[PDB]
Amino acid sequence: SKTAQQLKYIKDSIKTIPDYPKAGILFRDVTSLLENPKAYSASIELLSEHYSESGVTKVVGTEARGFLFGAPVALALGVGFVPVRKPGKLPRETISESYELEYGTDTLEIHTDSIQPGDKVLVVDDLLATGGTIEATVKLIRRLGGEVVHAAFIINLPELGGEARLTQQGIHCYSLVSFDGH
Amino acid sequence: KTAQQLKYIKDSIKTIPDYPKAGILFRDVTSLLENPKAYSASIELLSEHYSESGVTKVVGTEARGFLFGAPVALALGVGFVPVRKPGKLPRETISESYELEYGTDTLEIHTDSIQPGDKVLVVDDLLATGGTIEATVKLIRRLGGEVVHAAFIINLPELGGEARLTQQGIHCYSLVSFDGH
Numbered sequence A: 001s002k003t004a005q006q007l008k009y010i011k012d013s014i015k016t017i018p019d020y021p022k023a024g025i026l027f028r029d030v031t032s033l034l035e036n037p038k039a040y041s042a043s044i045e046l047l048s049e050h051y052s053e054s055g056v057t058k059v060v061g062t063e064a065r066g067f068l069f070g071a072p073v074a075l076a077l078g079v080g081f082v083p084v085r086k087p088g089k090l091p092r093e094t095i096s097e098s099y100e101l102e103y104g105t106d107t108l109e110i111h112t113d114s115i116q117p118g119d120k121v122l123v124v125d126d127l128l129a130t131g132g133t134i135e136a137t138v139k140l141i142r143r144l145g146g147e148v149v150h151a152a153f154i155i156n157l158p159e160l161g162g163e164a165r166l167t168q169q170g171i172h173c174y175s176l177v178s179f180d181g182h
Numbered sequence B: 001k002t003a004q005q006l007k008y009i010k011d012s013i014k015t016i017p018d019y020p021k022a023g024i025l026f027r028d029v030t031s032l033l034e035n036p037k038a039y040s041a042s043i044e045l046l047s048e049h050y051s052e053s054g055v056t057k058v059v060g061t062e063a064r065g066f067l068f069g070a071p072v073a074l075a076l077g078v079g080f081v082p083v084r085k086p087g088k089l090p091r092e093t094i095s096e097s098y099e100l101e102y103g104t105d106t107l108e109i110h111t112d113s114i115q116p117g118d119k120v121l122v123v124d125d126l127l128a129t130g131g132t133i134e135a136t137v138k139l140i141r142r143l144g145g146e147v148v149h150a151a152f153i154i155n156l157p158e159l160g161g162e163a164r165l166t167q168q169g170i171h172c173y174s175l176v177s178f179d180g181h
């Protein structure tokens, strides 16, 4: 009983903002969940319970909203958190992967020391839309030898394809809530 | 026992010579993040320190500030509110500029997230010049929030950030300090 009520409360605490960033999009605003202590802490408790017996040895989160759920999950699971960032922020040796934007490409980096061949890695992000940044993040992990077959999200937008696209690259996706639309 | 915990924290932070230029001993908080014991210790001390302060909201600026402020907010049981680079926040915002090496940038906050009566803690990873914190403090006070505290993992006191923040009425708390710019 507790857990289905907490999911509903989580989903209710995420505001919909029409026409951001442009017209016709029904933007799903995770910041309203952040500022509700009850919703935020439930979102972390539920993700942490979900993976507590999964053998995860590390969490990776991508900058910036991903830090907000990946790092607390890491803390609750008792494992290291590893950030993936835009270029030029990480100070130690990195590798990088480029990914498609609507116009052009961008890049994500990870510290080459922070993933090893025996790691079992959980990727955590706020919101799964088309999946491009997470697909690049999976590649970075795999290039260093880490296993990544789990990724977890507060929010899934399945009509944008991101879940199907990751799930066909061998990632088992878990999302607390989902919304229709683009 | 208490200095063993801070020493444990401090030793988990790596020093990278000559990044991003020669003479700079870069203090790299990412090695603390990958040590779960150092990382949880650092959140436990920060939150313990403010446990009787009456804080009602924690503010952290993107992105490293999110790694320390949001866990602190979860431990205090209070809302987290991000301050962001422009163009990322969906609801109504206000903006403040601060200074870079070359030029200026701006931070934004949601106007609905801070209100008169709020007691706000600002948390960041590392106190350097303090330009983003001063900007953050102004955002919060323009919305009527009260902010008298800022908390950090690392202080670089040779950059003068604590003095610059005392002058705006902010008490700084840091867990460890390093020399150098």
Ligand SMILES: Nc1ncnc2[nH]cnc12
Pocket (backbone or CB within 6 Å): A025, A026, A027, A028, A029, A127, A129, A157, A181, A182
């Ligand atoms: N509706 C939406 N809300 C939040 N982020 C998105 N990314 C793509 N569509 C989005």
Ligand SMILES: Nc1ncnc2[nH]cnc12
Pocket (backbone or CB within 6 Å): B024, B025, B026, B027, B028, B126, B128, B156, B180, B181
């Ligand atoms: N030595 C240093 N390490 C990390 N961040 C900094 N910002 C300014 N100086 C720094």
Ligand SMILES: [Cl-]
Pocket (backbone or CB within 6 Å): A063, A064, A065, A066
């Ligand atoms: Cl982001």
Ligand SMILES: [Cl-]
Pocket (backbone or CB within 6 Å): A149
């Ligand atoms: Cl499997």
Ligand SMILES: [Cl-]
Pocket (backbone or CB within 6 Å): B062, B063, B064, B065
């Ligand atoms: Cl940052």
Ligand code: NA
Pocket (backbone or CB within 6 Å): A112, A113, A114, A115, A116, A144
């Ligand atoms: Na490696």
Ligand code: NA
Pocket (backbone or CB within 6 Å): B111, B112, B113, B114, B115, B116, B143
């Ligand atoms: Na307000």
Ligand code: NI
Pocket (backbone or CB within 6 Å): A149, A172
């Ligand atoms: Ni499988």
